[PDB]
Write a protein that binds this ligand. Structure first.
Ligand code: EJU
Lengths: 29, 364
C-alpha cells in the first residue's frame, strides 16, 4: 500500500533522471 | 523472495596498503562507454576500468601533494559546458578538490570547512551543486561553476556534533543529514529562499563586481529527530519519500517523518513524530564509518561488514526479512568493507576494504 506507492514514486523519479542521463554525452575517462 | 545472485570474479590490493574509505562508479558515463570507478584511501585517489572476464584495469593514480591528507569521500560530476567528467574528493584536511580524472590534475579546491569532510554529494539535476558535510557540525552547498559557497546548513538548530552523512532526495528538492548527535535533519532546498540563493550564485560575476558573494546561513532545518537510533547515525540515504539510516545496532532502519499517512512535503518544521516502517538486519557491523549503498533504480541495497561479508537486499520485496539475498562472501575477504558501489546498470558491485583490497562481484 505505502510500499507500492513509494515504489511508483521511485519508478517515476528514476525515469525522469534516466531520460536526462540518456539526453547527454559525457566524455570517456 | 530475492532472485539476485553474484559471483566474485576478481580482487586486488592497492600498493599503499592503507584502508580504502570510498568507492564510486561513474554513473554519468554514457551507455556503451567503459565502466569506470574511483577509490580513495590515504592521500590517494585511484581510477579503474571494468572489463570482461573480471578484469580491473588500472587507469591513473592521483597522489595528493599533502602526505598527511586522508581522503574519506569522492563524488563524480560533469562540466555542464564541455560534458567533460570531473571527480571531487575530500577528507581529513577539510578541503574539497576538483580533479580532472583524465589528466589527474587538481583543477581547483575549496577551503572553508573548519574540520574534516565526511561526505561529498553532487545534486542529481545540477552537476555544479556540490554538498559537503563536516566534522565542523555543518553542511555546505557549493556552486563549482561560479566558485561560490551558496549556503551553510548549521547554527542554532543545526547539528550539535560531527555530521557523518547526507543524501539529496531523487529530484534534488531536499537533503537529509545525520551525525554524532544521533539526529537526522531535513533541509529543503526547493524553498523560495534556497532557490533564490541558488539563482544568485549563478548571477555572481567577480569581473563585474569587487564585493564578495554572500552565502545563506540556514540555522533551522525543516525537520529534526533523534527518535530513530540510540547512538551516532553514520549513513543516511533517501528511498523515495522514505529514509534509510543506520547506527551501530546492526540494522538499517526504514522510517519517515510524521505519522504513517503524513506527506513529506506537508510536514511542519515542528513535527515531533516519526514512523518506523521496518529494519534490514545484519551482523558484525557495530563499528563506526560503514556506508550502505543502493543501485540506480533502487531495487538493491548493499552493506559490507567488519569481517568482509557483503549483505544485499532486494528492495522490491516488501518484508525486509524476506528481502535478504545470499550474503556475498569470499574466504580471502576478511577485512572491513567500508563502502560498495554498483555500476549504473547494476551488473557489477565493487567492495573496498581496510586492507587496501578491492573486490569485484558480477551479477549472474
Ligand atoms: C567509510 O566512510 C564513511 C562512512 C560513514 C560516514 C563517514 C565516512 C567518511 N569518513 C571517515 C571514514 C573512515 C574513517 C576512519 C575509520 C577507521 C580508522 C581506523 N583504521 C586503523 C581502520 C580511521 C579512520 C574516518 N575517520 N573520520 C572520518 N572518517
Amino acid at each position: 500500500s505505502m510500499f507500492s506507492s513509494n515504489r511508483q514514486k521511485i519508478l517515476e523519479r528514476t525515469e525522469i533522471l534516466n531520460q536526462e542521463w540518456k539526453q547527454r554525452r559525457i566524455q570517456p575517462v | 523472495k530475492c532472485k539476485y545472485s553474484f559471483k566474485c570474479v576478481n580482487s586486488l590490493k592497492e600498493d599503499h596498503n592503507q584502508p580504502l574509505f570510498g568507492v564510486q562508479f561513474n554513473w554519468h558515463s554514457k551507455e556503451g562507454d567503459p565502466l569506470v570507478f574511483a577509490t580513495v584511501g590515504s592521500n590517494r585517489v585511484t581510477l579503474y576500468e571494468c572489463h570482461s572476464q573480471g578484469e580491473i584495469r588500472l587507469l591513473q593514480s592521483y597522489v595528493d601533494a599533502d602526505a598527511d591528507e586522508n581522503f574519506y569521500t569522492c563524488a563524480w560530476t560533469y562540466d555542464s559546458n564541455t560534458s567533460h567528467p570531473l571527480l571531487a574528493v575530500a577528507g581529513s584536511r577539510g578541503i574539497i578538490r576538483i580533479i580532472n580524472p583524465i589528466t589527474m590534475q587538481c583543477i581547483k579546491h575549496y577551503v572553508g570547512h573548519g574540520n574534516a569532510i565526511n561526505e561529498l554529494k553532487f545534486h542529481p539535476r545540477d552537476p555544479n551543486l556540490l554538498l559537503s558535510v563536516s566534522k565542523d557540525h555543518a553542511l555546505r552547498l557549493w556552486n563549482i561553476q561560479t566558485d561560490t559557497l551558496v549556503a551553510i546548513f548549521g547554527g542554532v538548530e543545526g547539528h550539535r556534533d560531527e555530521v557523518l552523512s547526507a543524501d539529496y532526495d531523487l529530484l534534488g528538492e531536499k537533503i537529509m543529514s545525520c551525525g554524532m548527535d544521533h539526529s537526522l535533519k531535513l533541509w529543503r532546498i526547493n524553498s523560495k529562499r534556497m532557490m533564490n540563493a541558488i539563482k544568485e550564485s549563478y548571477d555572481y560575476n567577480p569581473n563585474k563586481t569587487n564585493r564578495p558573494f554572500i552565502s545563506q546561513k540556514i540555522h533551522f532545518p525543516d525537520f529534526s529527530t533523534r527518535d530513530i537510533h540510540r547512538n551516532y547515525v553514520d549513513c543516511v540515504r533517501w528511498l523515495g519519500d522514505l529514509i534509510l539510516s543506520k547506527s551501530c545496532e546492526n540494522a538499517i532502519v526504514c522510517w519517515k517523518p510524521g505519522k504513517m499517512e503524513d506527506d513529506i512535503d506537508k510536514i511542519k518544521p515542528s513535527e515531533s513524530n516519526v514512523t518506523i516502517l521496518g529494519r534490514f538486519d545484519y551482523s558484525q557491523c557495530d563499528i563506526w564509518y560503514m556506508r550502505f549503498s543502493m543501485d540506480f533504480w533502487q531495487k538493491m541495497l548493499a552493506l559490507g561488514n567488519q569481517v568482509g561479508k557483503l549483505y544485499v537486499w532486494d528492495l522490491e520485496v516488501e518484508d525486509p526479512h524476506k528481502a535478504k539475498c545470499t550474503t556475498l562472501t569470499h574466504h580471502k575477504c576478511g577485512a572491513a568493507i567500508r563502502q560498495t558501489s554498483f555500476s549504473r546498470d547494476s551488473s557489477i558491485l565493487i567492495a573496498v576494504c581496510d586492507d587496501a583490497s578491492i573486490w569485484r562481484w558480477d551479477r549472474l
